[PDB]
Amino acid sequence: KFSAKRLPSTRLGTFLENRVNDFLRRQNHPESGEVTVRVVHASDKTVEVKPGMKARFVDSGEMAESFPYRTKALFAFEEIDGVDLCFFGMHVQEYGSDCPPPNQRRVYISYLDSVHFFRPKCLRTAVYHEILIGYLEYVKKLGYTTGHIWACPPSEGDDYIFHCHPPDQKIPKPKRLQEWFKKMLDKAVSERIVHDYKDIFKQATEDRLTSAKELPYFEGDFWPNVLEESIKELEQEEEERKREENTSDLSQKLYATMEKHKEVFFVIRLIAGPAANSLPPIVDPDPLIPCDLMDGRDAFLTLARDKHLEFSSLRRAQWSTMCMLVELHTQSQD
Ligand SMILES: CC(=O)SCCNC(=O)CCNC(=O)[C@H](O)C(C)(C)COP(=O)(O)OP(=O)(O)OC[C@H]1O[C@@H](n2cnc3c(N)ncnc32)[C@H](O)[C@@H]1OP(=O)(O)O
């Protein structure tokens, strides 16, 4: 059988699905189906500091040339009338206790995506939030201190994870998506999972950040590109000065840009103050899960394209879910 449930379990996946199914049982809605959450990829990776920042801080011995992290891909499924439906996916970057600052004990959501067929409709958003809150709860348990979220909605005709969304599945505007994450985080705060959360500018300001080398540096995130762009801006400005003499600040730029886009970037403190400073090493009890299909989002989108796996109607998404689960089961076995 190539079911979602028969996908190999992990502690993380089991923690999340139990949280979700406990929630659903409390709601006692006759339309809800059993939810399955599976981690389908886990591997060690490194994020490499880009040239501009490398020249300025890395070659100086001030900053690590790269940061080690574990990427995980997980999916949530709802079984309904005996049929599997993949309705939520997320990739995360987890920087461990052995990671050098400024990244140590941080988690970053690379991206998340959904297709809006969860049944019942009235519990869909609540279920998304239970998954995200459960995730924050879990990594907090392991000893990660801080979560990071870029509230970036996809551009028109862009799919983060699932190929071909339903035409009538609306894409939230920035403000709506921002409020969505705030509602999730506020619930996590009420449950004493999250200590507090701030926009990136307020956080930087309070942490007394003085140098770009202090800003957490994640794979594919907004800020590494802002810093490269900024550093080339400084390079151009130096050029014009040289022109002025006839021989033809970074922290200021970063703070300006942070303030401009602060609403879009959440810094989430799981463990604050003291307890954060005398933590044991993080030991993740789940094994690595090699799965080339799910290392980052590109491979699955390509697979979907090639085999025509759309998630554009309930029935189409269920069929694509079968094809997805078949691919995952077969790539695993041999
Ligand atoms: C993990 C990250 O860092 S990546 C950033 C987030 N990922 C994405 O934006 C990818 C694509 N978006 C999605 O998958 C989904 O929108 C999610 C998972 C983010 C949230 O899904 P939901 O819980 O259903 O909330 P969403 O804000 O999309 O929609 C809720 C309601 O607002 C409506 N809505 C959404 N966008 C709009 C819009 N632009 N205009 C008017 N209404 C809208 C929905 O139709 C829905 O209405 P309903 O509840 O009456 O049915």
Structural summary, described in words:
40% of the residues lie in helices and 19% in strands. Helix 6 crosses helix 7 (250-260). It has one domain (1-334). It contains nine helices and seven strands. Strand 4, helix 3 (124-142) and strand 5 form a beta-alpha-beta unit. The chain has a seven-stranded mixed β-sheet, sandwiched between helices. It is α+β, with helices and mostly antiparallel strands and 334 residues long. The chain has helices at 11-27, 51-58, 124-142, 174-190, 200-206, 222-245, 250-260, 298-307, 314-332, and strands at residues 35-48, 66-80, 83-95, 106-114, 146-150, 196-199, 265-269. Residues 109, 111-114, 116, 124-125, 128, 149-154, 160, 170-173, 176-177, 180 line the site of acetyl coenzyme *A. Residues 1-333 form the CBP/p300-type HAT domain. Acetyl-CoA binds at residues 112-114, 124-125, 171, 176, 180.
Oligomer: monomer
The radius of gyration computed from the alpha-carbon positions, rounded to a whole number of angstroms, is 21 Å
> Percent of residues in helical segments?
25-40%
Number of domains: 1
Overall 3D form: globular
Number of E-type strands: 7
Order of helices and strands: HEHEEEHEHEHHHEHH
Instruction: Determine the structural class based on helices, strands and strand pairing.
Output: alpha+beta
Number of helices: 9
Name the hetero compounds present: acetyl coenzyme *A
Strand numbers in spatial order across the main sheet: 1-2-3-4-5-7-6
End-to-end separation in angstroms reads 15 Å
Strand content bin = 15-25%
Largest sheet: 7 strands, mixed
Biased composition (Basic and acidic residues): 234-246
Protein name: Histone acetyltransferase p300
Modified residues (N6-acetyllysine): 50, 187, 213, 253
Binding site for acetyl-CoA: 112-114, 124-125, 171, 176, 180
